[PDB]
Amino acid sequence: KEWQENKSWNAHFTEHKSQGVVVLWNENKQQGFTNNLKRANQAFLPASTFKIPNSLIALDLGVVKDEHQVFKWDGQTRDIATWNRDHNLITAMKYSVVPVYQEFARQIGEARMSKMLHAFDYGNEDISGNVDSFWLDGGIRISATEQISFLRKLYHNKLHVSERSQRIVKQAMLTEANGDYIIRAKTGYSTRIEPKIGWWVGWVELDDNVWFFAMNMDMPTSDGLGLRQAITKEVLKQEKIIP
Amino acid sequence: KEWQENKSWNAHFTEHKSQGVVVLWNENKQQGFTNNLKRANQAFLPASTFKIPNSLIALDLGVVKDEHQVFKWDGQTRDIATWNRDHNLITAMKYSVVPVYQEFARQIGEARMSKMLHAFDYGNEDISGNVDSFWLDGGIRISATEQISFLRKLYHNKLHVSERSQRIVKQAMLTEANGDYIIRAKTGYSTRIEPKIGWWVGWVELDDNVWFFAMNMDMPTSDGLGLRQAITKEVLKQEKIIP
Ligand SMILES: O=C(O)c1cc(-c2ccncc2)cc(-c2ccncc2)c1
Ligand SMILES: O=C(O)c1cc(-c2ccncc2)cc(-c2ccncc2)c1
Ligand SMILES: [Cl-]
């Protein structure tokens, strides 16, 4: 009743000779759907999907004042051109600007970071590793279904940070909007520790329902990153959630 | 020069056998642009663009608890099908649901509505007429440049309501988002007093600037309503604000 497996969605992965999981949660009906119940519960490094809780914590502690505060480029040229510039919270989430969030994490510090992930009930709650890289190559692990549980709390302003912090992070998560739906989401790409995977987690707002989603997929090269959104959207289309 | 007139935009109205004004404001440069300085400063009924201030006031007074509160359809069949359903603040804005906002206005009441529009410096601040219809056929008037002035305060959380109220209304204004821009805006259609006009007011968020806009145009029939957005976007494209 609560979770239903739809193996027909595997066709959207084998289409591209790829492997992964899409997890959906119908908020109105309190019912979940996935192509792979086991992998839906397999826990991986969050990689840049960790920017959602990191943002919440940085805002609630005042490390980030608001979504307009500028974090200046430190002058080090990195391999991702969009990182080599000034950012605010909105553009730092849009371009997954790791070095900006590493500064947040150092200012938050290990103790507060650990306590807040416990308060959030986030994944395995384990920040072992460098305080500014554990979500990329440390001990923290989270599954797609755990991502959904966390996102539902955020959607409902039920996380143990201020309402304001939650509203700002949901603004920064804005990814796509049109007359048919709004998507608030965050991508991730885990490359430092095997298995290399891509993530996309968030939700689709409709007029009268919300569909939460979390997907990950094997990602041996960066060439396939667009499949994170494309496969998710094929599932959403199949299930008549978006046109 | 603070204000510049660009009459070449008139071609975008003439193309459609129309007349109107677009007003743009470059926030970084503090410079404004319009095709018609006179009409930019002529005042019209706000019609449904009034849902921006009405939302703010309803939220700040607690008439509306939050963006999820459901305003049940009163069961009176109206001729706009999307009005014959339950709404929250988000969908009421999206579908310009007049009867929901009329009830907001009744609960706000004349005295508080008047005081708040003065605090907002909103248009001619005149609510003469019926409290449940003055933005459709009463004495209130606002120009395109006055819409920009009000919207800039909202963007900066500088209106005399809480930050929370302003964030909620800006969420409810969300109209379009993609990798290139975000538009937050509200349409309007004034038919009860001549000249009948259409409005579109809001702003375009870019990575490193905001462009505020306010347009109105003659609208003898509802068949032309899509020109509000189409003409605005042609101006935005011409000025290399959006691709
Ligand atoms: O989520 C992404 O879309 C993405 C994330 C990263 C990244 C995130 C965190 N630590 C390192 C890299 C890198 C890239 C990328 C794009 C093109 N060519 C190479 C890499 C894309
Ligand atoms: O875009 C508009 O400005 C507009 C759109 C609708 C509408 C929304 C959804 N489905 C159909 C029409 C209704 C109205 C309206 C405003 C005031 N008095 C009556 C009608 C105006
Ligand atoms: Cl938003």
Side-chain angles (χ1 to χ4, degrees), chain A residues 66-68 85 88 90-91 94-95 155-157 163-164 167-168 170-171 174-182 184 205-208, chain B residues 66-68 85 88 90-91 94-95 155-157 163-164 167-168 170-171 174-182 184 205-208:
Chain A
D66 64 22
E67 69 272 27
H68 301 288
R85 68 180 67 165
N88 59 37
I90 305 296
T91 63
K94 171 173 180 186
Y95 296 109
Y155 176 86
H156 291 296
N157 298 329
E163 181 182 316
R164 172 181 178 273
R167 288 187 180 283
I168 294 171
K170 288 183 283 190
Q171 176 181 357
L174 178 61
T175 296
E176 187 175 6
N178 54 46
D180 297 320
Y181 60 80
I182 295 167
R184 307 186 181 272
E205 305 177 7
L206 306 179
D207 286 349
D208 54 356
Chain B
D66 60 33
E67 70 274 24
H68 305 285
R85 47 161 293 197
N88 56 37
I90 305 298
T91 64
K94 177 175 176 182
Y95 295 107
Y155 178 88
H156 288 296
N157 296 328
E163 179 182 315
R164 173 180 179 273
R167 286 187 181 282
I168 293 173
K170 285 180 281 186
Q171 176 184 355
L174 178 60
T175 298
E176 187 173 6
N178 58 46
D180 295 321
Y181 60 78
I182 296 163
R184 301 184 187 276
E205 305 178 8
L206 307 179
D207 283 350
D208 63 346

Coordinates of all heavy atoms in Angstrom, one line a residue, chain A residues 66-68 85 88 90-91 94-95 155-157 163-164 167-168 170-171 174-182 184 205-208, chain B residues 66-68 85 88 90-91 94-95 155-157 163-164 167-168 170-171 174-182 184 205-208:
Chain A
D66 N 21.6 36.7 4.2 CA 20.5 36.6 3.3 C 20.9 36.1 2.0 O 22.1 35.8 1.8 CB 19.7 37.9 3.3 CG 20.4 39.0 2.7 OD1 21.4 38.8 1.9 OD2 20.0 40.2 2.9
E67 N 20.0 36.0 1.0 CA 20.2 35.5 -0.3 C 20.9 36.4 -1.2 O 21.2 36.1 -2.4 CB 18.9 35.0 -0.9 CG 18.0 36.1 -1.3 CD 17.0 36.5 -0.2 OE1 17.3 36.4 1.0 OE2 15.9 37.1 -0.5
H68 N 21.2 37.7 -0.7 CA 21.9 38.7 -1.5 C 23.4 38.9 -1.1 O 24.1 39.5 -1.9 CB 21.2 40.0 -1.3 CG 19.8 40.1 -1.7 ND1 19.4 40.1 -3.0 CD2 18.7 40.2 -0.9 CE1 18.1 40.1 -3.0 NE2 17.6 40.2 -1.8
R85 N 34.1 33.3 -10.0 CA 33.4 34.6 -9.9 C 32.7 34.8 -8.6 O 32.7 33.8 -7.8 CB 32.4 34.7 -11.1 CG 31.2 33.7 -10.9 CD 30.2 33.8 -12.1 NE 30.8 33.4 -13.3 CZ 30.1 33.1 -14.4 NH1 28.8 33.2 -14.4 NH2 30.7 32.6 -15.5
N88 N 26.2 34.8 -4.8 CA 25.4 34.8 -3.7 C 24.7 33.4 -3.5 O 25.1 32.5 -4.2 CB 24.3 35.9 -3.8 CG 23.4 35.7 -5.0 OD1 23.1 34.6 -5.3 ND2 23.0 36.8 -5.6
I90 N 21.9 32.2 -4.1 CA 21.1 31.8 -5.2 C 22.0 31.2 -6.3 O 21.8 30.1 -6.8 CB 20.2 32.9 -5.8 CG1 19.3 33.5 -4.7 CG2 19.4 32.3 -6.9 CD1 18.3 32.5 -4.1
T91 N 23.0 32.0 -6.7 CA 23.9 31.6 -7.8 C 24.8 30.5 -7.4 O 25.2 29.6 -8.1 CB 24.7 32.7 -8.4 OG1 25.6 33.3 -7.4 CG2 23.7 33.9 -8.9
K94 N 22.7 27.4 -7.8 CA 22.5 27.2 -9.2 C 23.7 26.5 -9.9 O 23.6 25.6 -10.7 CB 22.2 28.5 -9.9 CG 22.1 28.5 -11.4 CD 21.6 29.8 -11.9 CE 21.5 29.8 -13.4 NZ 21.1 31.1 -14.0
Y95 N 24.9 27.0 -9.6 CA 26.2 26.5 -10.2 C 26.9 25.5 -9.3 O 28.0 25.2 -9.7 CB 27.0 27.7 -10.6 CG 26.4 28.6 -11.6 CD1 25.9 29.9 -11.3 CD2 26.2 28.1 -12.9 CE1 25.3 30.6 -12.3 CE2 25.6 28.9 -13.9 CZ 25.1 30.2 -13.6 OH 24.5 31.0 -14.5
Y155 N 9.6 21.2 3.0 CA 8.5 21.8 2.3 C 7.4 22.3 3.3 O 6.9 23.4 3.1 CB 7.8 20.7 1.4 CG 6.5 21.2 0.8 CD1 6.6 21.9 -0.4 CD2 5.3 21.0 1.4 CE1 5.4 22.4 -1.0 CE2 4.1 21.5 0.8 CZ 4.2 22.2 -0.4 OH 3.0 22.7 -0.9
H156 N 7.2 21.6 4.4 CA 6.3 22.0 5.4 C 6.8 22.9 6.5 O 6.1 23.1 7.5 CB 5.7 20.7 6.0 CG 4.9 19.9 5.1 ND1 3.7 20.4 4.6 CD2 5.0 18.7 4.6 CE1 3.1 19.5 3.8 NE2 3.9 18.4 3.8
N157 N 8.0 23.4 6.3 CA 8.7 24.3 7.3 C 8.8 23.6 8.7 O 8.7 24.2 9.7 CB 8.0 25.6 7.5 CG 8.0 26.4 6.2 OD1 9.0 26.3 5.4 ND2 7.0 27.3 6.0
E163 N 11.5 29.4 10.2 CA 10.7 29.5 9.0 C 11.5 30.3 7.9 O 11.5 29.9 6.7 CB 9.4 30.1 9.2 CG 8.5 30.1 8.0 CD 7.1 30.7 8.2 OE1 6.5 30.4 9.3 OE2 6.7 31.5 7.4
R164 N 12.1 31.4 8.3 CA 12.8 32.2 7.3 C 13.9 31.5 6.6 O 14.0 31.5 5.4 CB 13.3 33.5 8.0 CG 14.2 34.3 7.1 CD 14.7 35.5 7.9 NE 15.6 36.3 7.0 CZ 16.9 36.1 6.9 NH1 17.5 35.1 7.5 NH2 17.6 37.0 6.1
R167 N 12.3 29.1 4.1 CA 11.8 29.9 2.9 C 12.9 30.3 2.0 O 12.8 30.2 0.8 CB 11.0 31.1 3.3 CG 9.6 30.7 3.9 CD 8.7 31.9 4.2 NE 7.4 31.5 4.7 CZ 6.4 31.0 4.0 NH1 6.5 30.9 2.7 NH2 5.3 30.6 4.6
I168 N 14.0 30.8 2.5 CA 15.1 31.2 1.7 C 15.7 30.1 0.9 O 16.0 30.2 -0.3 CB 16.2 32.0 2.5 CG1 15.6 33.3 3.1 CG2 17.4 32.3 1.7 CD1 16.5 34.0 4.1
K170 N 14.3 27.2 0.0 CA 13.3 26.8 -1.0 C 13.3 27.8 -2.2 O 13.2 27.4 -3.3 CB 11.9 26.6 -0.4 CG 11.9 25.4 0.5 CD 10.5 25.1 1.0 CE 10.2 26.0 2.2 NZ 9.0 25.7 2.9
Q171 N 13.5 29.1 -1.9 CA 13.7 30.1 -3.0 C 15.0 29.7 -3.8 O 14.9 29.7 -5.1 CB 13.8 31.5 -2.4 CG 14.1 32.5 -3.5 CD 14.2 33.9 -2.9 OE1 14.0 34.1 -1.7 NE2 14.5 34.9 -3.8
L174 N 14.8 27.0 -6.4 CA 14.0 27.1 -7.6 C 14.7 26.8 -8.9 O 15.8 27.4 -9.2 CB 13.4 28.5 -7.7 CG 12.6 28.8 -8.9 CD1 11.3 28.0 -9.0 CD2 12.2 30.3 -8.9
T175 N 14.2 25.8 -9.6 CA 14.9 25.3 -10.8 C 14.1 25.6 -12.1 O 14.8 26.0 -13.1 CB 15.1 23.8 -10.6 OG1 16.0 23.6 -9.5 CG2 15.7 23.2 -11.8
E176 N 12.8 25.4 -12.1 CA 12.0 25.6 -13.3 C 10.6 26.0 -12.9 O 10.1 25.5 -11.9 CB 12.0 24.3 -14.2 CG 11.4 24.5 -15.5 CD 11.5 23.2 -16.4 OE1 12.0 22.2 -15.9 OE2 11.0 23.3 -17.5
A177 N 10.0 26.9 -13.6 CA 8.6 27.2 -13.4 C 7.9 27.6 -14.7 O 8.5 28.3 -15.5 CB 8.4 28.3 -12.4
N178 N 6.7 27.1 -14.9 CA 5.9 27.5 -16.0 C 4.4 27.4 -15.6 O 4.1 27.3 -14.4 CB 6.3 26.6 -17.2 CG 6.1 25.2 -16.9 OD1 5.2 24.7 -16.3 ND2 7.2 24.4 -17.2
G179 N 3.5 27.5 -16.5 CA 2.1 27.5 -16.2 C 1.6 26.1 -15.7 O 0.5 26.0 -15.3
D180 N 2.4 25.1 -15.9 CA 2.0 23.8 -15.5 C 2.6 23.2 -14.2 O 2.0 22.4 -13.6 CB 2.4 22.8 -16.7 CG 1.7 23.1 -18.0 OD1 0.5 23.4 -18.0 OD2 2.4 23.0 -19.1
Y181 N 3.8 23.7 -13.9 CA 4.4 23.2 -12.7 C 5.6 24.1 -12.2 O 6.1 24.9 -13.0 CB 4.9 21.7 -12.9 CG 6.0 21.6 -13.9 CD1 7.3 21.9 -13.7 CD2 5.7 21.1 -15.2 CE1 8.3 21.8 -14.7 CE2 6.6 21.0 -16.2 CZ 7.9 21.3 -15.9 OH 8.9 21.2 -16.9
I182 N 6.0 23.9 -11.0 CA 7.2 24.5 -10.4 C 8.1 23.3 -9.9 O 7.6 22.5 -9.2 CB 6.9 25.4 -9.2 CG1 6.1 26.6 -9.7 CG2 8.1 25.9 -8.5 CD1 5.4 27.4 -8.6
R184 N 11.4 22.7 -7.5 CA 12.5 23.1 -6.6 C 13.3 21.9 -6.4 O 12.8 20.9 -6.0 CB 11.9 23.7 -5.3 CG 10.8 24.8 -5.6 CD 10.4 25.5 -4.3 NE 9.4 26.5 -4.6 CZ 9.6 27.7 -4.9 NH1 10.9 28.2 -4.9 NH2 8.6 28.6 -5.2
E205 N 5.7 21.1 -7.7 CA 4.5 21.7 -7.2 C 3.5 21.8 -8.4 O 3.8 22.3 -9.4 CB 4.8 23.1 -6.7 CG 5.8 23.2 -5.7 CD 6.1 24.6 -5.2 OE1 5.4 25.5 -5.5 OE2 7.1 24.7 -4.4
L206 N 2.3 21.2 -8.1 CA 1.1 21.4 -9.0 C 0.1 22.2 -8.3 O 0.2 22.6 -7.1 CB 0.5 20.0 -9.3 CG 1.5 18.9 -9.9 CD1 0.7 17.7 -10.1 CD2 2.1 19.4 -11.2
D207 N -1.0 22.6 -9.0 CA -2.0 23.4 -8.4 C -2.6 22.7 -7.2 O -2.8 23.4 -6.2 CB -3.2 23.5 -9.4 CG -2.9 24.5 -10.6 OD1 -1.9 25.3 -10.5 OD2 -3.7 24.6 -11.5
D208 N -2.8 21.4 -7.1 CA -3.5 20.8 -6.0 C -2.7 19.6 -5.4 O -3.4 18.8 -4.7 CB -4.9 20.3 -6.5 CG -4.8 19.4 -7.7 OD1 -3.7 19.2 -8.2 OD2 -5.9 19.0 -8.1
Chain B
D66 N -1.2 31.7 5.7 CA 0.0 31.3 4.9 C -0.5 30.9 3.5 O -1.7 31.0 3.2 CB 0.8 30.2 5.6 CG 0.0 28.9 5.8 OD1 -0.9 28.6 4.9 OD2 0.3 28.2 6.7
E67 N 0.5 30.5 2.7 CA 0.2 30.3 1.3 C -0.5 28.9 1.1 O -0.8 28.6 -0.1 CB 1.5 30.3 0.5 CG 2.5 29.2 0.7 CD 3.4 29.4 1.9 OE1 3.1 30.2 2.8 OE2 4.5 28.8 1.9
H68 N -0.7 28.1 2.1 CA -1.4 26.9 2.0 C -2.9 26.9 2.4 O -3.7 26.0 2.1 CB -0.8 25.8 2.9 CG 0.7 25.6 2.6 ND1 1.2 25.0 1.5 CD2 1.8 26.0 3.3 CE1 2.5 25.0 1.5 NE2 2.9 25.6 2.6
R85 N -13.6 26.5 -8.0 CA -12.8 25.5 -7.3 C -12.2 26.1 -6.1 O -12.1 27.3 -5.9 CB -11.7 24.9 -8.2 CG -10.9 25.8 -9.0 CD -9.6 25.2 -9.5 NE -8.7 24.9 -8.4 CZ -7.4 24.7 -8.5 NH1 -6.8 24.7 -9.7 NH2 -6.6 24.4 -7.4
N88 N -5.7 28.4 -2.9 CA -4.9 28.9 -1.9 C -4.3 30.2 -2.5 O -4.6 30.6 -3.6 CB -3.8 27.9 -1.4 CG -2.9 27.5 -2.5 OD1 -2.6 28.2 -3.5 ND2 -2.5 26.2 -2.4
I90 N -1.4 30.9 -3.7 CA -0.6 30.6 -4.9 C -1.5 30.5 -6.1 O -1.3 31.2 -7.1 CB 0.3 29.4 -4.7 CG1 1.2 29.4 -3.5 CG2 1.1 29.2 -6.0 CD1 2.2 30.5 -3.5
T91 N -2.5 29.6 -6.0 CA -3.4 29.4 -7.2 C -4.3 30.6 -7.4 O -4.7 30.8 -8.5 CB -4.1 28.1 -7.0 OG1 -5.0 28.1 -5.9 CG2 -3.2 26.9 -6.8
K94 N -2.3 32.9 -9.4 CA -2.1 32.3 -10.7 C -3.3 32.5 -11.6 O -3.2 32.9 -12.8 CB -1.8 30.8 -10.6 CG -1.6 30.1 -11.9 CD -1.1 28.6 -11.7 CE -1.1 27.9 -13.0 NZ -0.7 26.4 -12.7
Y95 N -4.5 32.2 -11.1 CA -5.7 32.3 -11.9 C -6.5 33.6 -11.7 O -7.6 33.7 -12.2 CB -6.6 31.1 -11.6 CG -5.9 29.8 -12.0 CD1 -5.4 28.9 -11.1 CD2 -5.8 29.5 -13.4 CE1 -4.7 27.7 -11.6 CE2 -5.2 28.3 -13.8 CZ -4.7 27.4 -12.9 OH -4.0 26.3 -13.3
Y155 N 10.6 44.0 -3.7 CA 11.8 43.3 -4.0 C 12.8 43.4 -2.8 O 13.4 42.3 -2.4 CB 12.5 43.7 -5.3 CG 13.8 43.0 -5.6 CD1 13.8 41.7 -6.3 CD2 15.0 43.4 -5.1 CE1 14.9 41.0 -6.5 CE2 16.1 42.7 -5.3 CZ 16.1 41.5 -6.0 OH 17.3 40.8 -6.2
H156 N 13.0 44.6 -2.3 CA 14.0 44.8 -1.3 C 13.5 44.6 0.2 O 14.2 44.9 1.1 CB 14.5 46.3 -1.4 CG 15.4 46.4 -2.6 ND1 16.6 45.8 -2.8 CD2 15.2 47.2 -3.8 CE1 17.2 46.1 -3.9 NE2 16.4 47.0 -4.5
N157 N 12.3 44.1 0.3 CA 11.6 43.9 1.6 C 11.5 45.2 2.4 O 11.5 45.2 3.6 CB 12.3 42.8 2.4 CG 12.3 41.5 1.8 OD1 11.4 41.1 1.1 ND2 13.3 40.7 2.1
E163 N 8.8 41.0 6.8 CA 9.6 40.4 5.8 C 8.9 39.1 5.3 O 8.9 38.8 4.1 CB 11.0 40.0 6.3 CG 11.9 39.3 5.3 CD 13.3 38.9 5.8 OE1 13.9 39.8 6.5 OE2 13.7 37.8 5.6
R164 N 8.3 38.3 6.2 CA 7.6 37.1 5.9 C 6.5 37.4 4.9 O 6.4 36.7 3.9 CB 7.0 36.5 7.1 CG 6.2 35.3 6.8 CD 5.6 34.7 8.1 NE 4.7 33.5 7.9 CZ 3.4 33.6 7.7 NH1 2.8 34.8 7.6 NH2 2.7 32.5 7.5
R167 N 8.1 38.0 1.5 CA 8.6 36.7 0.9 C 7.5 35.9 0.3 O 7.6 35.3 -0.8 CB 9.5 36.0 1.9 CG 10.8 36.6 2.1 CD 11.7 35.7 3.0 NE 13.0 36.4 3.3 CZ 14.0 36.4 2.4 NH1 13.9 35.8 1.2 NH2 15.1 37.1 2.7
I168 N 6.4 35.7 1.1 CA 5.3 34.9 0.6 C 4.7 35.5 -0.6 O 4.4 34.7 -1.6 CB 4.2 34.8 1.7 CG1 4.8 33.9 2.9 CG2 2.9 34.1 1.2 CD1 3.9 33.9 4.1
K170 N 6.1 37.4 -2.9 CA 7.0 37.2 -4.0 C 7.0 35.7 -4.5 O 7.2 35.5 -5.7 CB 8.4 37.7 -3.6 CG 8.5 39.2 -3.6 CD 9.9 39.7 -3.2 CE 10.2 39.7 -1.7 NZ 11.5 40.3 -1.4
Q171 N 6.9 34.8 -3.6 CA 6.7 33.4 -4.0 C 5.5 33.2 -4.8 O 5.5 32.7 -5.9 CB 6.6 32.5 -2.8 CG 6.4 31.0 -3.1 CD 6.2 30.1 -1.9 OE1 6.3 30.6 -0.7 NE2 5.8 28.9 -2.1
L174 N 5.6 34.1 -8.5 CA 6.4 33.4 -9.4 C 5.7 33.0 -10.7 O 4.6 32.3 -10.6 CB 6.9 32.1 -8.7 CG 7.8 31.2 -9.6 CD1 9.1 31.9 -10.2 CD2 8.2 30.0 -8.8
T175 N 6.2 33.4 -11.8 CA 5.5 33.1 -13.1 C 6.3 32.2 -14.0 O 5.7 31.4 -14.7 CB 5.2 34.5 -13.8 OG1 4.4 35.2 -13.0 CG2 4.6 34.3 -15.2
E176 N 7.6 32.4 -14.1 CA 8.4 31.6 -15.0 C 9.8 31.5 -14.5 O 10.3 32.5 -13.9 CB 8.5 32.3 -16.4 CG 9.1 31.5 -17.4 CD 9.0 32.0 -18.9 OE1 8.5 33.2 -19.0 OE2 9.5 31.3 -19.8
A177 N 10.4 30.4 -14.6 CA 11.8 30.2 -14.3 C 12.5 29.2 -15.2 O 11.9 28.1 -15.4 CB 12.0 29.8 -12.8
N178 N 13.7 29.5 -15.6 CA 14.5 28.6 -16.3 C 16.0 28.9 -16.0 O 16.3 29.7 -15.1 CB 14.2 28.7 -17.8 CG 14.3 30.1 -18.4 OD1 15.3 30.8 -18.1 ND2 13.3 30.6 -19.1
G179 N 16.9 28.3 -16.8 CA 18.3 28.5 -16.5 C 18.8 29.9 -16.8 O 19.9 30.3 -16.4
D180 N 18.0 30.7 -17.5 CA 18.4 32.0 -17.9 C 17.8 33.2 -17.1 O 18.4 34.2 -17.0 CB 18.0 32.2 -19.4 CG 18.7 31.3 -20.4 OD1 19.9 31.1 -20.2 OD2 18.1 30.9 -21.3
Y181 N 16.6 33.0 -16.6 CA 16.0 34.1 -15.8 C 14.9 33.5 -15.0 O 14.4 32.4 -15.2 CB 15.5 35.2 -16.8 CG 14.4 34.7 -17.8 CD1 13.1 34.5 -17.4 CD2 14.7 34.5 -19.1 CE1 12.1 34.1 -18.3 CE2 13.8 34.0 -20.0 CZ 12.5 33.8 -19.6 OH 11.5 33.4 -20.5
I182 N 14.4 34.4 -14.0 CA 13.2 34.1 -13.2 C 12.3 35.4 -13.4 O 12.8 36.5 -13.3 CB 13.5 34.0 -11.8 CG1 14.4 32.7 -11.5 CG2 12.3 33.9 -10.9 CD1 15.1 32.7 -10.2
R184 N 8.9 37.1 -11.8 CA 7.9 37.3 -10.8 C 7.0 38.4 -11.2 O 7.5 39.5 -11.5 CB 8.6 37.5 -9.4 CG 9.5 36.4 -9.0 CD 10.0 36.6 -7.6 NE 11.0 35.6 -7.3 CZ 10.8 34.3 -6.9 NH1 9.5 33.9 -6.6 NH2 11.7 33.5 -6.7
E205 N 14.7 38.5 -12.8 CA 15.9 38.2 -12.0 C 16.9 37.5 -12.9 O 16.6 36.5 -13.5 CB 15.6 37.3 -10.8 CG 14.5 37.8 -9.9 CD 14.2 36.9 -8.7 OE1 14.9 35.9 -8.5 OE2 13.2 37.2 -8.0
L206 N 18.1 38.1 -13.0 CA 19.3 37.5 -13.7 C 20.3 37.2 -12.6 O 20.1 37.5 -11.4 CB 19.9 38.5 -14.7 CG 18.9 39.1 -15.7 CD1 19.6 40.1 -16.6 CD2 18.2 38.0 -16.5
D207 N 21.4 36.5 -13.0 CA 22.4 36.1 -12.1 C 22.9 37.4 -11.3 O 23.3 37.3 -10.1 CB 23.6 35.4 -12.7 CG 23.3 34.0 -13.1 OD1 22.3 33.4 -12.7 OD2 24.2 33.5 -13.8
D208 N 23.1 38.5 -12.0 CA 23.8 39.6 -11.4 C 23.1 41.0 -11.6 O 23.7 42.0 -11.5 CB 25.2 39.7 -11.9 CG 25.3 40.0 -13.3 OD1 24.3 39.8 -14.0 OD2 26.4 40.3 -13.8

